[PDB]
Amino acid sequence: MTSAFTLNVRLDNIAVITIDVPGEKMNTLKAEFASQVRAIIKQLRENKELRGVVFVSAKPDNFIAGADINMIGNCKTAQEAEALARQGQQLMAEIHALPIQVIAAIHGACLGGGLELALACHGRVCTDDPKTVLGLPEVQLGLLPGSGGTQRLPRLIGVSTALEMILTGKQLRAKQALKLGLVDDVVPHSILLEAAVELAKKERPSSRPLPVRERILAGPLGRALLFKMVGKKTEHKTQGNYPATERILEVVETGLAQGTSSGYDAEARAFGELAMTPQSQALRSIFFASTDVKKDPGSDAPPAPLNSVGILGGGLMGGGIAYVTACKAGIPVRIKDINPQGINHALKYSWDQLEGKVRRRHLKASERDKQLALISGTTDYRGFAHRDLIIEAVFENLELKQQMVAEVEQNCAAHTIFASNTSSLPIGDIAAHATRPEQVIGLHFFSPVEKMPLVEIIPHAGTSAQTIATTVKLAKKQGKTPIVVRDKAGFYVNRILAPYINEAIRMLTQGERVEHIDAALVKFGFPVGPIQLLDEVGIDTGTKIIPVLEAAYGERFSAPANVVSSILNDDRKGRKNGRGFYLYGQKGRKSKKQVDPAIYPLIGTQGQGRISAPQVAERCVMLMLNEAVRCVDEQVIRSVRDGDIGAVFGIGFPPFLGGPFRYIDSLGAGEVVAIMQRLATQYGSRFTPCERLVEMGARGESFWKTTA
């Protein structure tokens, strides 16, 4: 077969290394390819007439996608993972040690070890295509750049700037990469190799200058003061829950302060030990699960046409649906709302979202105006007879929704899908009177629609397999991570979140402050405390599903007696209207979030606060974990893969734990049964271990079969 790295030497005394991996659509840079590069480098120093070498992708979508993460998953111990890093560090050193000039012609994604390969080169030229992105995202997997990225990057673009790329793993477009010095020049794709061979002719590359902000911190005092500043800023964000953050600041520091060989030793040591940490094994479990979600078509049936969609109901919710289907899926969308202000809000919604991109980022306002041509709003019935799918986002009333179904069935074509955004109404009842109920399905979004990547797809008993496959294809085009959940009350996300929210409110009635509860679960790993979470979504919004959950399952979803009615009777609906819990009237830009002291008189407070922060998070998490196991036992979710994905992306479950089921397997089934059996003794039967979990605890069952 044709090798992954093909070399042909031009007659102008430069060589071109073509990187075409026939296995996958992306150059995954497998560790097995080390001998393929080592056989080529010897042929480069075969003749001294050569003047340069060029790495080109020869693939349309990416340059090098990054190191194959299956290599790490098969490492049995940290010493094997340390060897993979050293073997990678050994190859990048020999490419950099060539007497001729090595230059990378980048087009498409250049991430992970792909950027470490470009950093090992002497010059770089990338394409201005929006697909061309540069970054080191090894830390989203609980690792760090293991092929010299922590050492070559600070030496090139700037130490403080390199920390931002390594700590966050963010991608850089060609514009930002040229200014920071990561790429020497950007060039249209038509003359990329032609521009790359020119840079190879030149004897020396530019002796790059350092930015003034980096020269300001130059010196022993400034370098030690930067790491202490960054160490405190990342400790606030990660809450100390990510070991890669602490090892990155270490490896980057010692490499600058010690010998070149030592920094590479510190890097490979940190890479191998991080590969064995449970945090990285959990973060890589999300990477595998997210990849499996994109591959999963939801159904084996071919998807229906998807050339035009319409949405029923305007407002901020409808505008968010219209935004993601036109600005991400590229499908023209039309909005129907009998209230004109709902149309104005939905249209002014997408305008505000793109004007932010016009402000100091993607810009191209001509494309912004060209993007808004796909959205349209009306209060009449014109422009809907040929819509391929309808997303209903109207008031949560059963009679109103099945009335919208009849409108779609007579005013649209015979094949159009009716996708309901319902959260408390079953899909089967919406399609009860539908002439074609096989085309009625649930498509649950979470507000804000742009910030929430997870969506729930709820087919009812009579939903056709073709309808399921078409709705998930639309969700992926809209940049959403979908899970297909059964038609039961609460679905999965909001169901496992209600006792989590109820217990945080319960401790508010028992004397615990708002700051102590939210800071406890933020320390546990959640991005935002439960009290602040109920406020960002809205008080009535996050609590309206409680009655339906109590009527279908029992008293475990029961909230404190009258505190939910007492807060909504005081016009406190959260950050929407700026009343309740945390007060939002502050004027400070970075003003510390302060709670409204009047929320405690409204709530029936009885106590003085005698519960530590780990107990606070334990009481909230154990009630969520119990609901998660009940969903996978009742087949509400299709598998634990969807359950972990649904919680990490839906309710912000801490990613370093890998999801609720990875967390239970981390602690052990029988171990969490004893924990909840103890909480049930001193708090109430709502903490009773669920019926499925005691079976797993009595045996040696785990949620994910291959154990570790």
* DSSP per position, 86-115: HHHHHHHHHHHT-SSEEEEEE-SEEETHHH
Residues 199 and 319 in one domain: no
Burial 180-206 (b: 16+ CB within 10 A, else e): bbbbbebbebeebbebbbbbbeeeeee
Judge if 283 and 310 occupy the same domain: no
Q: Contact at 8 Å (CB) between 620 and 504?
A: yes
Let me know whether 404 and 506 are in one domain. Answer: no
Q: Is the residue at 704 inside a domain? A: no
Q: Give CA–CA dist 446/450, Å, rounded.
A: 9
Within 8 A by CB and 6+ apart from 23, the residues are none
10 beta partners? none
Q: How was this structure determined?
A: X-ray
**Side chain identity, residue 398:** L
Check whether residue 123 and residue 173 sit in a common domain.
Answer: yes
Alpha helices, DSSP H only, in 174-333?
Answer: 174-180, 192-201, 212-216, 220-238, 243-257, 260-276, 278-295, 315-327
Find out whether 121 and 54 touch, Cβ atoms under 8 Å.
Answer: no
- Packing angle, helices 220-238 and 159-168, rounded to 10: 20
Kind of pairing, strands 133-135 and 172-173? antiparallel
Q: How far apart are CA 286 and CA 359, in angstroms?
A: 33
> What's at 252, amino acid-wise?
V
CA atoms within 13 A on the CB side of 483: 28
The domain boundary, picked from 455, 490, 525, lies at 490
Check: CB of residue 109 under 8 Å from CB of residue 63.
yes
Instruction: Give the distance from CA 695 to its chain's centroid.
Output: 33
- Sign of the Cα torsion 551, 554, 555, 560 reads negative
| Total count of domains within the chain | 3
Sign of torsion over alpha carbons 90, 96, 97, 103 = positive
Which one, of 203, 185, 181, 207, lies nearest residue 194 by Cα? 185
| 368/591 Cα distance (integer angstroms) | 33
What is the domain range of residue 644?
Answer: 491-699
**Could you confirm whether 367 is annotated as catalytic?**
no
Expressed in percent and rounded to 5, the helix, strand and coil fractions of the chain are 50, 10, 35
- Residue 249 class from Cβ within 10 Å (0-12 exposed, 13-18 middle, 19+ buried)? buried
Under a CB-based contact definition with an 8 Å cutoff, are residues 540 and 569 in contact? Answer: no
Catalytic residue selected from 82, 138, 253, 456: 456
The DSSP H or E segment spanning 651 is: none
With 0-12 CB in 10 A as exposed, 13-18 as middle and 19+ as buried, what is 483?
A: buried
Residue 434 in domain: yes
Q: Where a domain ends, among 305, 337, 370?
A: 305
- Does 682 lie in the same domain as 608? yes
Does 473 share its domain with 613? no
**Which of 436, 460, 490 finishes a domain?**
490
Establish if 705 belongs to a structural domain: no
> What is the DSSP secondary structure assignment for residue 668, as one 8-state letter?
-
Task: Select from 453, 620, 640 the least CA-distant residue to 523.
Answer: 620
Residue 708 included in any domain: no
Residue 376 resides in a domain: yes
Return the SS3 of 540.
Answer: helix
Is there a contact between 569 and 575 (Cβ–Cβ < 8 Å)?
no
23, 59 contact by CB (below 8 A) = no
- In this structure, are 30 and 54 located in the same domain? yes
> Which contiguous run of DSSP H or E holds residue 421?
none
Give whole-number Cα distances, 70 to 59, 81, 357, 607, in Å. 22, 12, 36, 52
Contact, 350 vs 268, CB < 8 A? no
Would you say residue 557 lies in a domain?
A: yes
Does residue 484 sit in the same domain as residue 470? yes
The verdict on residue 706 lying in a domain is: no
8 A C-beta contact, residue 368 and residue 358: yes
In this structure, are 310 and 280 located in the same domain? no
For residue 149, what are the CA distances in angstroms to 70, 164, 169, 216, 437? 20, 13, 12, 23, 55
Work out whether strand 440-444 and strand 454-459 pair parallel, antiparallel, or are unpaired.
antiparallel
Q: Are residues 514 and 660 in the same domain?
A: yes
Residue 366 placed within a domain: yes
Please tell me the distance from the alpha carbon of residue 366 to that of residue 196, in angstroms, as a whole number.
31
The angstrom resolution of this structure is 2.7
Same domain, 191 and 63: yes
Q: Which two tokens stand for residue 189?
A: 């794709």
Query: Is residue 276 located within the same domain as residue 389?
Result: no
